[PDB]
């Protein structure tokens, strides 16, 4: 490479909020992230976060079977 135009690469410490640490190289020796590959919802198989909804509607009402027949 040309000298004096290039940011310098060093061993880097990317930290996640799950406590995943990643061994890599970067222009900054230490970085923290909010999220990573090791914990993300879409990422971890199909960990369907806050909603394992299945909708639930619309057959789902069912309140109740008390209307007469």
């Amino acid at each position: 490479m040309k000298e004096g135009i290039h940011p310098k690469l060093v061993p880097a410490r990317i930290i996640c909020g799950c406590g995943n640490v990643i061994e890599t190289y970067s222009t900054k020796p230490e970085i923290y992230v909010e999220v990573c590959s090791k914990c993300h919802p879409f990422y971890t198989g199909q960990q369907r976060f806050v909603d394992t909804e299945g909708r639930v509607e619309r057959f789902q009402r069912r309140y109740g079977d008390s209307y007469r027949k």
């Binding site: 040309k2 940011p7 310098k8 990317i14 900054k28």
Partner: protein, 181 residues
Amino acid sequence: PLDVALKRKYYEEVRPELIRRFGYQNVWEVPRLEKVVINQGLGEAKEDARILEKAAQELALITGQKPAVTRAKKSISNFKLRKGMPIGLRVTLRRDRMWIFLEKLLNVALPRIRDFRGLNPNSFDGRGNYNLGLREQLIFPEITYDMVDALRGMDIAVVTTAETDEEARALLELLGFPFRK
């Protein structure tokens, strides 16, 4: 040269599994990465504040490599464009710096992305190459909220040595690209 995780992972896990699925008879027949090119079609800096050392300083931190200018090929009325006007940046990553960038890209960037639901399956060249877009450069780890004046994403082109989308798809998924469908 540098030992890094993805570069290592390619030879160790990606290489053999690929030779499995498609049964190549030559080591060079099997899919490789050649280059990842990063681009910022910018052009918001056509006239206005054609001082984009702020984004060249950005891209230089993201990739550890000084971007080059792109300039207008032809003048355009509707775009307010003088021929030769400075309208974008482009850095070409090969070899070690290519891996290191993809490494941070796959492990960090795409996760930090707004409502990420997987890379687009269909952005495949037809000749086995792949392209994707970013709305924000904050998506990376080396760019804090502080050091930015404005939102500026980018174009990302990854070239394979593959011939079909299918070998390309496999090479990239095996490396660690998250596809929705």
